Design a binder for this molecule. Structure first.
Ligand code: HEC
Ligand code: HEM
Ligand code: HEM
Ligand code: HEM
Ligand code: HEM
Lengths: 50, 51, 139, 101, 379, 79, 47, 238, 60, 68, 109, 54
């Protein structure tokens, strides 16, 4: 049971989010490059960030 | 359901309820163990050390 | 007269469901009148027999009206020609075929198709051209 | 009774087992009770059922219906299997009741 | 001596399955769709194997890969559009076979019917994963919409959706996982179909009349092999009509634009085979209720054998059940049309009523009507 | 299990068949075929058709209603 | 018994060459088989 | 609210009709002289026009006209090359953001699949190109936006791109706006579906082959099934 | 007198080897004939459009 | 000269058609209504859509014949 | 009643194949390799399917994709090297298996 | 097989596809293998029929 749990967990985690995606989890947005009255849309977490 | 409504089947249910409950506990422990469900496992003393 | 106003008010070639409902109401009214006259003149043996005759006549008339209205409106929509009498002719022939089916006779169906379709086309032509079946005395 | 009989006759004609020469019991789903009832049928009735079913299947194979004169009438349709099926179902019900208690 | 066909093991299995199988002599052309379904599965497998030799699953190269297949691979367009429209033919035959089993009481073959339900779910999963592979705007946004439905599942929806995505949102990981799953699943479908045929052969095949046809069994080889070849030729005629005259009739034009995760397409609608489930899902306001209803739509088939109340297996001799069945078919068409249409005043109410009618016809009206027919026949 | 020899018991059913080469593949294909097709269509149509007619009515009504919904309302701009 | 049933007439289905009951079928066997197998060969060529 | 494009009687609408390759050649002229500046066709290359509307020599001459960046040299620096038939059509802007900057925040879409991408196909493009109109009363257009009724939203960053005598065709065909739009739409249809004519030919061949095979296979099925169809079954109980 | 079909049966169709020889040779010649004919049909339907028709005006 | 585009001629022909004429009249009426109102939010886009639908449907049948 | 293992068709097939198959009592450990070959086949299929979820076949991205599997993917290195060495284990078992067939005259089948 | 003059992107993609598909064909050939073996049983280290000792 111990061995099977470990193996199945390893595969399932392999299907889980990889290191690069988790590194891209947090985004830094540089303000003062967005003019006033303008909305800048960035791809953060794979979805539009306003 | 018509056939399985009688005194014998009620007796049969009582005989197997202890086994069904025990198997249900086995499923409950296995799910918590496999998923490492921290909600349930936090209560358990020694396994609590994991977190 | 309200049923006739209901059928006329719906624009031709539009709201086919409402047009079919109006035609069905008209057919049902005509069937009810015919059933009343049949019951009076030719007595029914039992109340259940009278009800059966009334139901048969009323359903035949309502089916004729519903088929006529449905087919005429659908033809007007698909052809997209609203004022053409051919749509009324098609509806009338469909009504005659329905009458033949209800009477379970091919000859009744064909004769009804011809006569009823021609009458419906004539009615549409009268609508378009302003023909008066009953003329107000003007001299 | 006459009204119910008229509606029943309308359903009988609306269904097409008469058109193919089949009787009503010929069209029953062959569940285990029906299988035992068929097993209990007398030889003449079983053979008649087999031939009627075969003829109906052949007619459906060619997408044809039997001549209208040969259609089974509502009056003359005989429920041959119903008594045997009733007996079988009674035996099954008795066994189930014994099992219950 | 012995005939090798009847004595060799593999030849024995093949003979029992398709050469000497006792087949009802009155099976109609609705009994040709299943073999058409197997032909569709084989055709999909071959066309996809040839497509995958040229397809790359990276987000940078997927759309360019499909364009390379269409414009540069020799006869690549034939393979690509054969696959695309063959999926539609697949689902057409699937729906027709489900209808045939419903109408003729073939669901009484419980094991075969349930294995078929599993096969239907697997094929739907395969089609959904395949649509994401081209990586057009429709692929990306439809995947986002459909996968996000799993988040509704309580207390595990978010984790499950992220696990499937491979990340926070649909991205390169999801595309690669879907390519792998799309490749593997059809072979699982083939094995399940083998089990399906095994269970069917255990009980034989139901005839249109619904009555046992052991008396009128005919050999499959000299009769249904040629009938199925003719049916396959007709299906090929239709599929090639699609492939060579209307290659894009059944596909949305938006999937020919590269996926932009920052701009949604004007209309996000699933493939036509999925549209009825989409309409059912949109009908229920609550998200979890929508997901559960979408699951129940396919899973209601499992309850079909239990709901049976007629003393007759087939609907051929039951008219009112025939009227209800055709009402159900019209309702399914209406659900597809509503799922295609935008959510607005006229369509929303129609979709809600249609979903209610679908479930009502399957669960309530049909059995009560069967009971009424049983009373009318004096059974 | 299910093999031709032991499928079922049948007695006294005689079947007469003709060789394929001795009989025409299409006998009376149109003289008899078209009337039979018409008969089957007559039988089926009453049950099959009405629901699709209902569908056509619903479809036309929905499309027209959506078109009307998009259309401008004069009262909104009366003031 | 077995002598009280005669094979039903198939004349309507029969081919023209074999319609007559006073003519040997071996004369037309080649023609009939050739027509059927010609249909088969043409189908095979197209396939 | 949107206006559906009218269905113009394109030559290739026929079931077994082929694109007019003369119109394809004029459409390529139109693209290379008008549209290429803003729009791009990444998925089409000069080799693709070697047996469609230009000859191999013509295609190579066309390619040599446009310079292309080449892989870095021994020094490690990129250089510009005359151009080859293998090269794809030059991209107007280096990156999408630069294209948006050039065109008032709107990205000129790629025209390789535009006809397939947009509902209405060539009809939509033709109407949009020939459908520019003065803004309707009560409708105010933002700066840099031109009213086009067919375009979704009725506001388009693109200025009226085709006008009479925008380009001079080699064939000498009058360079009316309608003619230019027709040729360009034909070329775009070829771009989206380079297999259009071959698909049509295969369709004709398949239709004839099916017309032959289906009756013959049906005849074979009838031949095999005649034994059952003519079968006469008689129940003779004792 | 043997008919044409009877002669075909006896000469070729009777023995399946000659049947397959007929099938294959007919396949070769039918490929040639049908491809030629259908190509002619399509070229006629689209005469003056296909590049092959107009290649001369621009070559050389 | 000016190479009169067949589009101009065909749209002028289509404007001389009953559906086009009535659509144009409705458009003109809505134009007057919208212009009069100082702060109305209404637009004539729908009436223009009707008129252009009729006109360009006629132009679809007519135009391509001229363009060779 | 009947035993479900015998009666049920799929269960019957499984039972005859693996559960109640008549087996020689003396077959030695050399006979174990065939089941080891099946286990290797199953393990290879699973591991390669989990690798394929992260592997792109374009020449530009293949090597970088295997490096992504090894480094970034969680436990990806375990899967990758399981697949690589499982191929070797598969071939070792295949050679031992064919050697057993040759040595014990199993080729008579 | 190469898909071109030499080994290149086409060869790699083809090989990925074939590599994916072939193991399943192996999984079916194994079932055929087991059916054929079950017909004749399993040989013993002695090489003498073992129907007596099963
Ligand atoms: C800049 C000088 C342009 C040239 C010359 C042409 N186009 Fe263009 N186009 C341009 C921009 C900035 C835009 C975006 C407008 C918007 O908001 O969509 C466009 C758009 C189009 C479209 C619309 C496609 C769509 O998004 O649905 C089409 C169909 C199109 N352009 C075609 C086209 C043609 C045929 C041209 C010359 C023959 C052409 N464009 C030139 C900028 C410019
Ligand atoms: C890939 C998908 C499928 C394939 C390839 C397939 C294949 C087949 C084949 C070849 C047959 C026998 C031929 C025939 O009866 O016409 C069959 C029978 C059957 N299938 Fe399917 N099928 C598929 C999906 C389904 C689905 C989705 C269902 C139900 C929801 C289903 C239910 C049935 C039933 C009930 C039968 C028995 C029919 C009868 O006995 O008359 N199958 N299938
Ligand atoms: C029943 C089986 C299958 C079905 C129903 C199916 C369905 C689909 C559909 C609908 C598409 C989208 C086509 C498009 O958008 O143009 C697609 C794409 C694709 N599928 Fe499948 N598929 C099946 C099996 C397979 C198999 C077996 C493979 C590989 C072995 C495969 C590989 C692909 C590829 C490479 C594409 C991309 C084609 C493109 O982008 O145009 N599929 N599939
Ligand atoms: C069934 C027997 C199989 C054998 C003998 C086998 C063998 C191999 C070998 C030797 C490699 C290269 C090892 C390396 O990375 O240096 C490899 C790579 C690979 N195989 Fe397997 N394989 C098998 C099954 C499968 C299956 C069924 C799949 C399904 C996807 C698969 C997917 C892959 C992938 C994606 C790679 C490249 C990933 C990597 O390089 O790590 N394999 N295979
Ligand atoms: C993936 C490939 C293969 C698989 C999965 C496989 C599997 C098996 C299995 C499970 C058995 C049962 C006996 C045992 O376990 O030893 C067996 C027996 C056998 N196999 Fe295969 N095998 C494979 C390849 C081969 C090859 C390459 C050969 C010969 C070239 C072969 C020849 C045999 C023979 C002769 C036997 C008889 C064993 C006996 O005498 O009991 N197999 N195989």
């Amino acid at each position: 049971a111990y061995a099977a749990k470990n193996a199945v967990s390893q595969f399932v985690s392999s299907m889980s989010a990889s290191a690069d995606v988790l590194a891209m989890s947090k985004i830094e947005i540089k303000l003062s490059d967005i003019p006033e009255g303008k909305n800048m849309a960035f791809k953060w977490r794979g979805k539009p960030l306003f | 359901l018509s056939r399985f409504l009688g005194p014998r089947y009620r007796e049969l249910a009582r005989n197997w309820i202890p086994t069904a409950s025990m198997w249900g506990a086995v499923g409950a422990v296995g799910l918590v163990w496999a998923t490492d469900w921290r909600l349930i496992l936090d209560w358990v003393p020694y396994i609590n050390g994991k977190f | 007269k309200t049923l006739l106003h209901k059928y006329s008010d719906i624009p031709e070639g539009t709201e086919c469901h409402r047009k079919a409902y109006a035609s069905t109401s008209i057919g049902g009214a005509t069937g009810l009148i015919v059933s009343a006259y049949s019951i009076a003149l030719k007595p029914p043996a039992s109340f259940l027999e009278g009800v059966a005759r009334t139901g048969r006549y009323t359903f035949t008339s309502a089916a004729i009206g519903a088929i006529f209205g449905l087919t005429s409106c659908i033809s007007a929509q698909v052809r997209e020609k609203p004022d053409d009498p051919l749509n009324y002719f098609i509806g009338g022939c469909a009504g005659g075929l329905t009458l033949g089916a209800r009477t379970r006779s091919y000859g009744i169906g064909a004769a009804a198709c011809a006569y009823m379709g021609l009458t419906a086309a004539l009615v549409k032509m009268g609508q378009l051209e302003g023909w008066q079946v009953f003329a107000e005395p003007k001299v | 009774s006459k009204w119910l009989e008229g509606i029943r006759k309308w359903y009988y004609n609306a269904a097409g087992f008469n058109k193919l020469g089949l009787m009503r019991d010929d069209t029953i789903y062959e569940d285990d009770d029906v299988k035992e009832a068929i097993r209990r049928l007398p030889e003449n009735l079983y053979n008649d059922r087999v031939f009627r079913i075969k003829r109906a299947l052949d007619l459906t194979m060619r997408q044809q219906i039997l001549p209208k004169e040969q259609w089974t009438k509502y009056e003359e349709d005989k429920f041959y299997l119903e008594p045997y099926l009733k007996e079988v179902i009674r035996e099954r019900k008795e066994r189930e009741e014994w099992a219950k208690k | 001596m012995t005939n090798i066909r009847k004595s060799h093991p593999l030849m024995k299995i093949i003979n029992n399955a398709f050469i000497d199988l006792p087949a009802p002599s009155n099976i109609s052309s609705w009994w040709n769709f299943g073999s058409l379904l197997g032909i569709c599965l084989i055709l999909q497998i071959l066309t996809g194997l040839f497509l995958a030799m040229h397809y790359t699953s990276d987000t940078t190269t997927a759309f360019s890969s499909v364009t390379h297949i269409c414009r540069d691979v020799n006869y690549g367009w034939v393979i690509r559009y054969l696959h695309a429209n063959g999926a539609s033919m697949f689902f057409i035959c699937l729906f027709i076979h489900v209808g045939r089993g419903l109408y003729y009481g073939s669901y009484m073959f419980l094991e075969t019917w349930n294995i078929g339900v599993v096969l239907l779910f697997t094929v739907m999963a395969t089609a959904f994963m395949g649509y994401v592979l081209p990586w057009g705007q429709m692929s990306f946004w439809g995947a986002t919409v459909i996968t996000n439905l799993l988040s509704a599942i309580p207390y595990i929806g978010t984790d499950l959706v992220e696990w499937i995505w491979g990340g926070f949102s649909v991205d390169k990981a999801t595309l690669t996982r879907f390519f792998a799953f799309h490749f593997i699943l059809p072979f699982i479908i083939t094995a399940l179909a083998a089990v399906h045929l095994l269970f069917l052969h255990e009980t034989g095949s139901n005839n249109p009349t619904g009555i046992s046809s052991d008396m009128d069994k005919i050999p499959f080889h000299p009769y249904y092999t040629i009938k199925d070849i003719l049916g396959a030729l007709f299906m090929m005629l239709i599929l090639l009509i699609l492939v060579l005259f209307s290659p894009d009739l059944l596909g949305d034009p938006d999937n020919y634009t590269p996926a932009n995760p920052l701009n949604t397409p004007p209309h996000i609608k699933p493939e036509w085979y999925f549209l009825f489930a989409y309409a059912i899902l949109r009908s229920i306001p609550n998200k979890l209720g929508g997901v559960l209803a979408l699951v129940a739509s396919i899973l209601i088939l499992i309850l079909m054998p239990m709901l049976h109340t007629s003393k007759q297996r087939s609907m051929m001799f039951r008219p009112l059940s025939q009227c209800l069945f055709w009402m159900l078919v019209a309702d399914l068409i209406t659900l597809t049309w509503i799922g295609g249409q935008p959510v607005e005043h006229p369509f929303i109410i129609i979709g809600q009523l249609a979903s209610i009618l679908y479930f009502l016809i399957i669960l309530v009206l049909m059995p009560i009507t069967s009971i009424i027919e049983n009373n009318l026949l004096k059974w | 299990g299910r093999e031709f020899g032991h499928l079922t018991r049948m007695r006294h059913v005689i079947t007469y068949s003709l060789s394929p080469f001795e009989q025409r593949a299409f006998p009376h294909y149109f003289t008899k075929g078209i009337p039979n097709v018409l008969r089957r269509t007559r039988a089926c149509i009453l049950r099959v058709a009405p629901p699709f007619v209902v569908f056509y009515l619903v479809y036309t009504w929905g499309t027209q209603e959506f078109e009307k919904s998009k259309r401008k309302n004069p009262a909104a701009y009366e003031n | 018994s077995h002598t009280d049933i005669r094979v039903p007439d198939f004349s309507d289905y029969r081919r023209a060459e074999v319609l007559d009951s006073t003519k040997s079928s071996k004369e037309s066997s080649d023609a009939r088989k050739g027509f059927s197998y010609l249909i088969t060969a043409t189908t095979t060529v197209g396939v | 609210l949107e206006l559906h494009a009218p269905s113009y009687p394109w030559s290739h609408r026929g079931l077994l009709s082929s694109l007019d390759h003369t119109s394809i050649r004029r459409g390529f002229q139109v693209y290379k002289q008008v549209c290429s500046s803003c729009h791009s066709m990444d998925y089409v290359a000069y080799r693709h026009l070697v047996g469609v509307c230009y000859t191999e020599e013509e295609a190579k001459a066309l390619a040599e006209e446009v310079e292309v960046q080449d892989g870095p040299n021994e020094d490690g620096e990129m250089f510009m090359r005359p151009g080859k038939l293998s090269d794809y059509f030059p991209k107007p802007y280096p990156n999408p953001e630069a294209a948006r900057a050039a065109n008032n925040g709107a990205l000129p879409p790629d025209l390789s699949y535009i006809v397939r991408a947009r509902h209405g196909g060539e009809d939509y493009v033709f109407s949009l190109l020939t459908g520019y109109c003065e803004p309707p009363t009560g409708v105010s257009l933002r700066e840099g936006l031109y009213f086009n009724p067919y375009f979704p939203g009725q506001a388009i960053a693109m200025a009226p791109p085709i006008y009479n005598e925008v380009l001079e065709f080699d064939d000498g065909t009058p360079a009316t706006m309608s003619q230019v739009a027709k040729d360009v739409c034909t070329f775009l249809r070829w771009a989206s579906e380079p297999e259009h004519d071959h698909r049509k030919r295969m369709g004709l061949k398949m239709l004839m082959m099916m017309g032959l095979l289906l009756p013959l296979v049906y005849a074979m099925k009838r031949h095999k099934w005649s034994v059952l169809k003519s079968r006469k079954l008689a129940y003779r109980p004792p | 007198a043997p008919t044409l079909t009877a002669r075909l049966y006896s000469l070729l169709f009777r023995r399946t080897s000659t049947f397959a020889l007929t099938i294959a040779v007919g396949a070769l010649f039918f490929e040639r004939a049908f491809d030629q004919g259908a190509d002619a049909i399509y070229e006629h339907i689209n005469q003056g459009k296909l590049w092959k028709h107009i290649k001369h005006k621009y070559e050389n | 000269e000016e190479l009169v585009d067949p589009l101009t001629t065909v749209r002028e022909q289509c404007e001389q058609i009953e559906k086009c004429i009535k659509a144009r009249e409705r458009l003109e009426l809505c134009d007057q209504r919208v212009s009069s109102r100082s702060q109305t939010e209404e637009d004539c886009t729908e009436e223009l859509f009707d008129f252009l639908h009729a006109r360009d449907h006629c132009v679809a049948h007519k135009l391509f014949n001229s363009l060779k």
